[PDB]
């Protein structure tokens, strides 16, 4: 009934290297995908995703109810007032099926200047007990740096794509201060699956999460090989095919702002599927004070009628609004 979205597979491996011409050919593919459905799969990305899925599986299946309250964000545990972003997002059996664990920059330590200042959107990660989840924290922190690496490469391709030098975005994306996050989302198999956990789209499609744009510069997403995502195009919502060997890449609304909608943030939603699966996004966020002057690559002088917006401002408003629009996750 629903047709397949154009989601090209792009070999992003020249973005790690020093062959400048070959990086420009990748840039072009990124430009094309970004002007069309707004999604592509990055292939030859160098990350061991089957291990990521295994380590993440072992965590989700072995965390206990007790641990979840102990790690819970403020929205679920009012004792944990500093936990706005990072920690455990509980399901509600009978009502909200999905659950997840979010963590931030491992460099956000108690001595970090932004943590000392108590700056919004900066928090110190919470972790389960090492003896109960041996290896998990070190694996997860390592994953953050491996996906950080991929995202830097990708941001070099988007820079080149937009007619900029390759460091245009990446110079704002730094280990010591990035607001980027990993979310380890568990979608369960449930029998019976509670209707209260299923939303219905205007067109009748059963959904786990409604239409939205991403709160990010770009999103770098690993998921299981279970089809679920749809993207709105001028021909209506189209199905994004699953590929659990690549990363699904799209632009968030920060990119749309900077480029004056030359690279739109694609509107997408998550169909309801009764399957035990994973969705493991990395939201590529810049630094709290990062400001890029907005521009327009469709205009001869490159000038835009949008005003500069600091990443920190964008992020804190965005994440609130997303909760308001689509509910607490």
Active site residues: 209, 212, 214, 268
> Cα–Cα–Cα angle for 168, 149, 228, nearest 5°?
100
CB 269 → Fe ion: shortest distance, Å?
8
Integer Cα distance of 171 and 155 in angstroms: 10
Considering only residues 83-102, where is the footprint of ligand V10 by CB under 6 A? 85, 98, 100, 102
Closer CB to Fe ion, 31 or 213, in the complex: 213
Q: Which stretch binds ligand V10 (CB under 6 A): 54-62, 207-215, 234-242, 257-265?
A: 207-215
DSSP, res 240: P
Q: Among 33, 42, 49, 183, which residue interacts with ligand V10 (rule: CB under 6 A)?
A: 183
The answer to whether 1 is annotated as binding is no
- Per CB under 6 A, 155 contacts ligand V10: no
Name the nearest CA neighbour of 104 among 141, 151, 49: 141
Nearer to ligand V10, 285 or 304 (CB): 285
Contacts of 154 (CB under 8 A, 6+ apart): 12, 15, 30, 42, 218, 220, 249, 284
Q: Rounded CA gap, 207 and 73, in Å?
A: 24
Helices (H), the chain: 20-35, 49-62, 65-70, 113-116, 136-161, 253-258, 311-326
What span, in angstroms and rounded, lies between the C-alpha atoms of 131 and 318?
37
Asked whether 167 and 156 are in contact (CB, 8 A), the reply is: yes
Determine whether the annotation assigns residue 85 to a binding site.
Answer: yes
Q: Looking only at residues 266 through 305 of this chain, which bind ligand V10 when binding is defined by CB under 6 A?
A: 270, 279, 283
89 is in an annotated binding site: yes
Which of these ranges, 128-136, 164-172, 180-188, 232-240, lies near ligand V10 under the rule CB under 6 A? 180-188
**Of 14 and 266, which CB lies nearer to ligand V10 in the complex structure?**
266
Beta bridge partners of 233: 236
Which tokens in the block code for residue 59? 């965590």
Applying CB under 6 A, the span of 136-144, 156-164, 179-187, 297-305 interacting with ligand V10 comes to 179-187
Q: Is 143 annotated as a binding residue?
A: no
Q: Which stretch binds ligand V10 (CB under 6 A): 6-14, 48-56, 178-186, 256-264?
A: 178-186
Is 214 within any annotated ligand binding site? yes
- Interacting partner of 309 out of ligand V10, Fe ion, none (Cβ under 5 to 8 A depending on kind): none
254 is in an annotated binding site: no
CA-closest candidate to residue 319, choices 219, 213, 185: 213
User: Among residues 2 and 320, whose Cβ is nearest to ligand V10?
Assistant: 320
Angle (nearest 5°) at CA 294 between 291 and 300:
150
User: Is 268 annotated as belonging to a binding site?
Assistant: yes
Helix, strand, coil percentages for the chain (3-state, nearest 5): 30, 20, 50
- Whole-number Å distance between alpha carbons of 13 and 34: 18
Residue among 24, 207, 226, 322 that touches ligand V10 (CB under 6 A): 322
Residue 114 contacts which entry, Fe ion, ligand V10, none (Cβ below 5-8 A, type-dependent): none
- In the complex, the residues that contact ligand V10 under the rule CB under 6 A are 85, 98, 100, 102, 181, 183, 185, 209, 212, 214, 270, 279, 283, 319, 322, 329
Known binding residues are: 85, 89, 181, 187, 212, 214, 268, 277, 279
């Amino acid at each position: 009934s629903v047709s397949k979205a154009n989601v090209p597979k792009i070999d992003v491996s020249p973005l790690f290297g020093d062959d400048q011409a070959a990086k420009m050919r990748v840039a072009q593919q990124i430009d094309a995908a970004s002007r069309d459905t707004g999604f592509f799969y990055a292939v030859n990305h160098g990350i061991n995703v089957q291990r990521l899925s295994q380590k993440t599986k072992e965590f989700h299946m072995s965390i206990t109810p007790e641990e979840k309250w102990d790690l819970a964000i403020r929205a679920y545990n009012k004792e944990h007032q500093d936990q706005v972003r990072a920690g455990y997002y509980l399901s509600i059996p009978g009502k909200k099926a999905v659950e997840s664990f979010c963590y931030l920059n491992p460099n956000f330590t108690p001595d970090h200047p932004r943590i000392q200042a108590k700056t919004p959107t900066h928090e110190v990660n919470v972790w389960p007990d090492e003896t109960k989840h041996p290896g998990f924290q070190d694996f997860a922190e390592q994953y953050y740096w491996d996906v950080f690496g991929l995202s830097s490469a990708l941001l070099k391709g988007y820079a080149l794509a937009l007619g900029k030098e390759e460091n245009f975005f990446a110079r704002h994306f730094k280990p010591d201060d990035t607001l980027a996050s990993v979310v380890l989302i568990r979608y369960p198999y449930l029998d019976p699956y509670p209707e209260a956990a299923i939303k219905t789209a205007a067109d009748g499609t059963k959904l786990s999460f409604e239409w939205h744009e991403d709160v990010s510069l770009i999103t770098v997403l690993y998921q299981s090989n279970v089809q679920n995502l749809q993207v709105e195009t001028a021909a209506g919502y189209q199905d994004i095919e699953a590929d659990d060997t690549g990363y699904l890449i799209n632009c968030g609304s920060y990119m749309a702002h900077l480029t004056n909608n030359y690279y739109k943030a694609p509107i997408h939603r998550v169909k309801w599927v009764n399957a035990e699966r994973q969705s493991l996004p990395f939201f590529v966020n810049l630094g709290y004070d990062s400001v890029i002057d907005p521009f327009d690559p469709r205009e001869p002088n490159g000038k835009s009628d949008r005003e500069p917006l600091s990443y920190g401002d964008y992020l804190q408003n965005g994440l609130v609004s997303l909760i308001n629009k689509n509910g607490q996750t």
